[PDB]
Symmetry: D2
Subunit: 222 residues, 4 copies
């Protein structure tokens, strides 16, 4: 698809969570074919963040998903124009989020740009988010399905955000993946298992952390 | 409240619904104390909108609410600084919207400026919105409750967008009302009844519509 | 409708909340035309209840609703066969409830019988319900609407359960009202404001409390 | 676990969906260790059901789950006492169901008895269920997580009931798995993948259908 085994990517997130506007920029290396990525994020505006940085995580690339040969890779096939995605975040405490990502490709640079807009609200002031009581997301299995006569995908995943107290914090992810160009081939409903971790790196001069994700496409084990 | 019986208001809305970007601007005259208002909207970008306009309606002011003396008017009391609002639209069919509005009032201009940011997704292609089969919102009764120790308000209302077939289409509105400065006083939980309508007014050069809203504050009967 | 100004009623609730089976019986007096009712409840089985008794409250009669003349009283018109209702309870903490009520009339006795089945689950062990941290429901306004070509009603109300800490506890009430006989006249969408209070009366020999409700039908004040 | 590679099971179901009461009884053969099972159902009351049978399917055993040695099988470990389950069905169109099952095993009979209580409402009259336009459930992947200090399990899965038009119909399954006696050990969060199908087998004297399910436990890949 014009993809390298190893890739670099850029991040620019524009957001407002519970009235708090902020600005995050990033950089990363990834293995499209490995379904792995490691990114570095920085709050260049609105920091330090008043909420849990874990809610932004997934709003930062399905391209970085190791697909089987028997399965159509909507995302990679997306090369070279890229694609866009929108996602609803339904937290168990009533908080609501919408995220919009625009994936574009710096072909010769072999760099994938990500431009996102994140909007979240109704995050309880006592919640783990407002109280920054989170730690990491739990491993998951997302259902990916094609939209008949549409050329788009639908991602369905029930997320669990692990808290310091040891508890879980539930969130429903509902995504729509839209390729920038009409897709010749469409995949069949499948699954995407993921592993996303955050490791802070804030100094005291800057709020930063590093993200990391691993994902493999799979079919129903039946 | 430094407000006038009759006034004016200006609107500027930016949004991307189901990936469709659009810009809307409006003008209006209102009666803060009557809780009445009529507004004229004109899509000045992304028109014509590929979805129903009905979804954007409420996304265009709690200042325009007839409040009883017995009840604290957090909104009017919001002067001079003004206030802001955040809202989540939970449509029965899976669609998700978020709207944030920044409210500011010009004394010298006797106008109320509204700057909204409407975002929505997961609007089923064959849905009433995507297939523009909506007519009007059914009259509501919203619940306004104070957030102890937060200085903010919470609005809760179950909306119904009336369809052409005469079928209702459900949507849960969850609002957060926050004044720009620390509130001197807080009201008690109460209700707000509203009636909002839409009259199309598009031509061929531009897509336009008129909005109207009447709201009255109330207590438990 | 054969209704008296003053009425007596009987209660028999069969339930299981979070695995806890219980049995409540009751008796009450009401004013159909006043839209008022006062009932006395007793846990004859499964007591003392492990959960907050406030969740059962509304599962105990729209007949007791003061209607305007301009508005059709589906419920009273229901005389003399009575009617049935089913309701879903969606609590903010994930707990789920379904309630089914069967309203029958002891015509000459002028007594209204109520036979209910209550099923609730996913009530967090730390919740106000499990922790019995509730006190009373807050006043509400329910939307009542007709079902085109069905002869049934739909009740929509967002409930708030007041806690001891002073906080609210949200619950979505979604009802279906089915008259025992084909209705000649149907009402137009309207509203029903309610006030429901609980006043314990458990001795130490028996778990009991008294309920009380006031309700008036209204049209959109527009 | 006192269980047998191959076994039998008996079913008795009582329910009132949308006010329609019904009684169902079934017989089956299963492979606890294979996580496989086939069951034969017969409406012996309230038939024919006015709604889709597909809704009752999952309402008919986590014992039948192929579990890796590396993972704790809370269900099989549930022997001898057995276990119970509670589940909420959150259908996209507003329908609401609750199902509770009491699980008991006869050593001497090598059969597993299932006593369910299915309740459901708000099934849109023109819905796929009410208009019986459903075919089968799409293969799933459920999330099984332990409840610390409770001795219970929590199952989470987003279901899709396939329609005749080939359209999917959404339903959220939220389960609570509770053993009859204090568990010696607890498993770690893991997944359960399932494949469940329905083959009609009604005649004219009785309404019958066959159910089949294959489930395998798994960890994060």
């Amino acid at each position: 698809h014009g993809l390298k085994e190893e890739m670099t990517m850029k991040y620019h997130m524009e957001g407002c969570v519970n009235g708090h506007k902020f600005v995050i920029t990033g950089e990363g290396i990834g293995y499209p074919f490995k379904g792995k990525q490691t990114i570095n994020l920085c709050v260049i505006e609105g920091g330090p963040l008043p909420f849990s940085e874990d809610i932004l995580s997934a709003g930062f690339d399905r391209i970085f998903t190791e697909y089987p040969q028997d399965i159509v890779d909507y995302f990679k096939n997306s090369c070279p124009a890229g694609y866009t995605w929108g996602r609803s975040f339904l937290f168990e405490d009533g908080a609501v989020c919408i995220c919009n990502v625009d994936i574009t490709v710096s072909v010769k640079e072999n760099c994938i740009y990500h431009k996102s807009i994140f909007n979240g609200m109704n995050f309880p002031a006592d919640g783990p988010v407002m109280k920054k009581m989170t730690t990491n997301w739990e491993a998951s299995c997302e259902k990916i399905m094609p939209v008949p006569k549409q050329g788009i995908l639908k991602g369905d995943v029930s997320m669990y955000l692990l808290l310091k107290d040891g508890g879980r914090y539930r969130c429903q992810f509902d995504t729509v993946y839209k390729a920038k160009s009409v897709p010749s081939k469409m995949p069949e409903w499948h699954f995407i298992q993921h592993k996303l971790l955050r490791e802070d790196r804030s100094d005291a001069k800057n709020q930063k952390w590093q993200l990391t994700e691993h994902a493999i496409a799979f079919p129903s084990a039946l």
